[PDB]
Design a protein around this ligand. Sequence first.
Ligand code: ZQC
Ligand code: ZQC
Lengths: 193, 193
Amino acid sequence: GDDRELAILATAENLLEDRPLADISVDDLAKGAGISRPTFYFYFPSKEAVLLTLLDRVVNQADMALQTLAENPADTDRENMWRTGINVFFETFGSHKAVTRAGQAARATSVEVAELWSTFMQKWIAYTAAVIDAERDRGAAPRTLPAHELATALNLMNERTLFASFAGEQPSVPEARVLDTLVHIWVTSIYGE
Amino acid sequence: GDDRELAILATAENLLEDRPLADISVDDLAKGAGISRPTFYFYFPSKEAVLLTLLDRVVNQADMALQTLAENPADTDRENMWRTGINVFFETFGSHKAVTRAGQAARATSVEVAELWSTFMQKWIAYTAAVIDAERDRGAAPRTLPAHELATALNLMNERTLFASFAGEQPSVPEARVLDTLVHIWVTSIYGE
Ligand SMILES: CSc1ccc(C(=O)Nc2nc(-c3ccccn3)cs2)cc1
Ligand SMILES: CSc1ccc(C(=O)Nc2nc(-c3ccccn3)cs2)cc1
């Protein structure tokens, strides 16, 4: 039951590493999972539904890691606090590059994917803004931009920049430089002038 | 000749304001332009080619405006210099929101659109990096990140953030706040710490 579903999901993620979803057939997923095509349709209405489930697993993995960090602050400076948080997304999405790339493309064509994306970005922006507000309340950061608007731009930067790096887009920041680049921009814009 | 082509382009941009390219037919473009379907195919091989031409016109409009600014520096402070430059993209793309949104979506499906996008982003990143380097050479900005990597992240932020605002995405920065938001992040990250 759950094992056949997990096999479909694992087959899809493996296949997505070498071709887009448009070039993956329901028969390809069934074959890789060791099941028939009608048995596949018992577990998933379509191949798009499989991608939705994969993306749901990745974004919840990142969200749960961020929640763990928020409850267990590492004892360190302000720059390291932001780096450890941005690293959650660098490492989680960077460990699932094929699902990340496919989910990014599916947002233009799937309202379900677009709504999942929007839901979690709203959550992560709200958390970012809450941390900025706490830094301002304690006197560590100046009251410059509205914190929620600043948080929105910084999160959109991370989404676009991380995913360009993972996909090797031209142009992009090299993957080995992207964490340092983003941390610099977050720390200077949150604590500067 | 050129007038029929301009009529096709104007019809396409008008139609894109209320439905995506997928819901615009070649017959719709021909009808709006006052021509037959075979006459359309004399000017454009497809509706995707029409969008490519529209997007080419918009990005060259922005590029030419930036070139004009680069030759005619406004006499003002460093924050205003960056604001005037970012405003080129805010105003040019914001005046062609339907073409911008359609071109953004077409990048996932059109190598021609993706290559046009990449070509101009590389050009604008190189210019950004050259200005950062000049500010460092004159002692106004500190030597922090590699200027080209900083410029890449800041340009990707602007692309993602401006276009989310224009499309009214959730989440997004309100359009009336997005210029101030981006300028703050550029100025603090270029001149800070
Ligand atoms: C310390 S607080 C903090 C630090 C970093 C971020 C961050 O990078 N958020 C991002 N979200 C995405 C994303 C991707 C797909 C769907 C939805 N969201 C990519 S990167 C967020 C909060
Ligand atoms: C003063 S130097 C400067 C200031 C601001 C920018 C900037 O916003 N660049 C952007 N490019 C795009 C874009 C969109 C579609 C295709 C290619 N590029 C959107 S925003 C660039 C250079």
